[PDB]
Amino acid sequence: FVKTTVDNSFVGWDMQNVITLDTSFEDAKTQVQLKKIHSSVILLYCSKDE
Amino acid sequence: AVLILSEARSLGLTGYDFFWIVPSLVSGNTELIPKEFPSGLISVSYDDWDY
Structure with missing residues (x-):
């Protein structure tokens, strides 16, 4: 839904990255994958504990 | 230097x-x-090895 809304409106949205960090993300995946996002707005989507 | 290069390779500053x-x-x-x-x-x- 986000990708459809972004690529269809008129304002002009520059969506930088889409990250899907799976597994228990103990220390490896989280740290190696979260270091690229250095934009100004982050749109989280997860359960409470995650 | 080893630590800094190892931490910078993760950031993505060591490409072609x-x-x-x-x-x-x-x-x-x-x-x-x-x-x-x-x-x-x-x-x-x-001088590496010529000297």
Whole structure:
């Protein structure tokens, strides 16, 4: 839904990255994958504990 | 230097188009190259083996 809304409106949205960090993300995946996002707005989507 | 290069490779600054240059004291003995040194370290040093 986000990708459809972004690529269809008129304002002009520059969506930088889409990250899907799976597994228990103990220390490896989280740290190696979260270091690229250095934009100004982050749109989280997860359960409470995650 | 080893720590900084290892932390910078994670950030994504060590691709085909990133050139690192370091003085002699970073590579001051040779033949003991660590694991984290990339290929293309343009480093000046005292005469390697001709002297």
